[model samples]
Structures are given as structure tokens and as C-alpha cells.
Target: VPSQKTYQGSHGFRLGFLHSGTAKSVTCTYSPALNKMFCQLAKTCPVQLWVDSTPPPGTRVRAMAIYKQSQHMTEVVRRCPHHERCSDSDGLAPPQHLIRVEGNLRVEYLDDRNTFRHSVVVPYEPPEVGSDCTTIHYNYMCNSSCMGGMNRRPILTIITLEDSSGNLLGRNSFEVRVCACPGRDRRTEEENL
Candidate 1:
């Protein structure tokens, strides 16, 4: 028995399905690396099979059944979200491009790690551009433990842009970790004066 499992994060997962004990051998068009499968009925015979409910994370399945006399399996699958469109032309929408940035994206660390800030300039582009573009920013706070006991450590900062509809447009990442240890305190020196 396959044990239940949990997943975190996204964009990189795999899953598959299999079965046994049937009159006719059931074959599937499944790809492990892609984590996709396609099921099709050979003829109008009574078809019964158990799909592995315990699929690995990120698994997508699509099955189609056609009756002998009349049944539009193509229509059903095309409408089904689980299946890809039968034809690339039908029910297809044009790709929406993200808005362009006026200049290079910039990210900064405020208070030397107390907080982080990001800024970018977005200029007006031709309306003919594919989609409306806007700049997006994000920040995540970290506890002291993230610094490895107060000593400065190198940290990578990642910036992402998303549209109002929550679609990811682009990502830019860079390293920004600076440490000035054994440094004199300006406040302490000023007291002597």
C-alpha cells in the first residue's frame, strides 16, 4: 500500500498511476517525468477500472471514453479541466505578456537587515504591448536564528513580479549580505567629544 504523503513548495513534483486484476490489460499513456497520463477506451465495451487515488503530488490525469454508436469523447475531454484541449486552435487564448520595466530592478536592505525594501521604475510603454505590466515586490522577515548567532552571514534576496490577477510575470534575484564586525561605534566615540 502506498502511504500518504505531503508536499510543500511548487513547480517541481511528480506522480504516476497503475492497476492490476482486469479482464484486459489496461495500458496508460503516462510520463513519470512530466507527471501526466492519458486514458482512452478502445471500443464501446463496458469499461471499469480503478484509478490510483494515492497519486504523488502534482499528478494530472485525463481519461476519455467513446461509445460504439455515438459519443463525442473529444467534446467531453476538451471541456474537462483535467484534460488538455483536443485542438490547439479551438478554445485557445493568446498569451498575455507582462509590462516592461523602465530600467533595471533594484532591491535594498534597510537598517542593515532590520527590514528590506524594493523599488523599480516603470515607464509607459506602447499600448500595443501584449498585457498591462506593473511592478510587484515582496519581503519576508527572518528571526535572529537566520543570522547564525548574530554573526553576519551571506543571504540571497529574490524579487518577483506578479500581475493583479496573481500571475507571475518575472523574477530577479541577487545576493545582499554585508558585515562590518570589529567596527567602532559612532555613538560611543561621540560621547567622548
Candidate 2:
């Protein structure tokens, strides 16, 4: 029902804070002040507190929770013949943007202990453009590629929440998986359907 071009901007909610092991907290906001800040886990748990201030340029934040909904919407994707054919089909699928999440995620209180602030990114990788699929297929893109029909790679990142200060925030360790792999399109089954 849609094209892969929309995928580039469709990842607004890919990174966020999780609650109750399944529920997610809202994140990914933009402002002139805060360029791109992920919501921190709230002290209240259910509520979300956005990172109101801007992090330094080229801050290189890791494990800010860039992990969500990579393959959740497959109905809109295109169909190709072989895995290679569909993955590398002659269409303009944008290369997955780079984002990361790492380290200890905790809730800090501000404004009379009522304000919630957090510092953590996500562990997400976007859809393959075209050449990346070929690279992924050949195991040239990552250290670990394509296992159990799932292209997942474990990531270990030590994020510095406050690089200037000597205070350590925490530890973030999670596996970052590749986006969905395309499936084969049946030729004879739907040649003239």
C-alpha cells in the first residue's frame, strides 16, 4: 500500500523507553533547542520526560534505545522473485539510517522531583537501500550476518551520558538486528492472478 521511500521518515518511534516489559514510552522529538533527544525513562514509570536540552554536536551517544518496529509493517513493502531479487530490486529503497542505544537507563528527577529526564538512545537499523542487501547477503556488511533466517547482530556499546563529567550513568548491552529480509514472490502461483 506504500513505497519504501516513505521508510526514511517512518521511523519516528523506533527509539523509546519501555515500560512493564512490553509497553513503550513516547520519544523522538525535535525542536530548535533540542535537535534530537530521546525520552528518558520517567520516575513515574508510565509518563515520559523528553530530553529538553541539546547534546553537544557529534556527541556520539550510544544505546539510546533505537529499537522498535523495523519489520512490523511488511504489507506496504514491494514483492520480488527471489530473496536477492526482492531485496535488491530496481527500486529506490533508502539505506537504513544509523542509530544506536547503550548503557544503564534510569530516571532522574528534576523540578521538585516531579520532572522526569532520561539519557538513552535506541538500537535500531533501517531498511536496506540496494547495494547493502548484496553486501549483507555476502556477509560483508557485518561481523555476524544472516543466521536462522534472521539477520541479527549483537551489540555492546558503553555510552557516555555526560562525557565532560566523570559521573558514569550505567551500562547498555543489547543485540541490534538488521531490518526485515525480503521474501520470494511466487511466479507461477500468481503469474496471471
Candidate 3:
């Protein structure tokens, strides 16, 4: 896996687009002629387009996907206790420790059609109980079709944490917006009215 630091470039504008609820990935590149960034969504759906005009100087932009692998892999290993000394008299064998114990991180969103869509970002290994940098990556998805003069709609992002035991530890939600693909332009439609 590549580190996030490796994704950052030395220079250029920073922008991103997210396509959710599908297998396709988005590609964004810089066009020097226009001095603006242009991107195309892999398929026709509601996409979330974002631009950061004022990123740290000399840092290029990276178009990261909102989702990751659908299934996660895990393994079991034997290891001694972290604390105290272990001797032959203590035990005949080392104890088994489960790796990748943290379960999948589930993300849900409301689409343009007023229906809910979900995707799993990745298998998140949680940090220690006390840490300030606990922010998770953003999970985004395209909305359903936008017809009948509908361009803007409320978007919500929900996140959930579940353990291997099939129990939920915590959940949260936030407000967001989705790009509209309605046929007519807003100002053009209003002018005709």
C-alpha cells in the first residue's frame, strides 16, 4: 500500500471528485492550457465534485476514491504477553492474538432519488483509546438520477463502527451535497419562467 504522503505532488491545483455506489473510479488531471482542472466521471450518476483552490503551496492534488476493498483479510498468530516475563513454568505455549480485529467501516449516504445507498470504505484498524488524530477518510457516492427539474438536494453521510462480534460500537452522521445532472441549467430554466 502506498502512503498518503506519496500521493501529494509538488505543484498544481488541488481538486477531487467522488463516485459512490459503483465499481468505477474517477480520474482527474490538470490542463495547463485552461489553467483549470477538468475531470470526467466514469459513468452517468450523481457525483460529488470538490475543489480546493488554496491548498498548501507547491502541493499537487490527488483524486482519491471514497471506497476501498469490499472484503478484508485477517489472520491469527501466537505471541507472548506484552507485560511480565514468560517462563516454561508459566505456560506450555504462547497465547494466540488476533490480527486485524477491527471490522469493516460502513458508510451510508442519501441519494438524489431520496433513497439510501451504502458502501464499505475499508477495514479500519483503530488507534489507541486516547489519540487526537482519529479522523477517518471521507466516504462519498454518487446520487441516483436527477429528473423533473431537480438539481439540488440534501445529502447526508453516515458512518458506523462494528466489531468482529457483529456489534456496533459507534455511529455518526454529517451533512453534505451531491452534484446534480438534471438536463437544464438552473439560471436558464428560471429565465424561461
Q: Please state every model's RMSD to the true fold in angstroms.
A: 28.2, 19.8, 20.3
> Each candidate's lDDT (Cα)?
0.22, 0.23, 0.25
Off by over 4 Å in 1: 1-150, 181-193
Off by over 4 Å in 3: 1-117, 127-131, 139-151, 179-193
Tell me how candidate 2 scores on lDDT: 0.23
Q: What are the per-residue Cα lDDT tens digits for candidate 3 across 72-165?
A: 1111111224211323221211112101111222322112133122122333333335632233333122321223111223322333333444
How big is the RMSD of model 1? 28.2
CA displacement after TM-score superposition, residue 70 of candidate 1 (Å): 56
Overall local distance difference test of candidate 3: 0.25
- lDDT of the structure predicted as candidate 1: 0.22
Q: Tell me the deviation in Å of residue 107 in model 2.
A: 26
Model 1 lDDT-worst window of ten: 91-100
TM-score of every model versus the real structure: 0.20, 0.21, 0.28
- Candidate 2 residue-wise lDDT, 36-127, digit = tens: 12222111111121222433332222222222235432211111122323243112221121221222232221111332211233222222
Ranking of models by lDDT:
3, 2, 1
For model 1, how does the per-residue alpha-carbon lDDT over 1-193 read when each residue is reduced to its tens digit?
A: 1111222123222212332212123322322332222222111111111221222322321111111112321221011221222232111121110111212243221111331222222221221235322222121111112222212232222233233343433333332211121012222223355
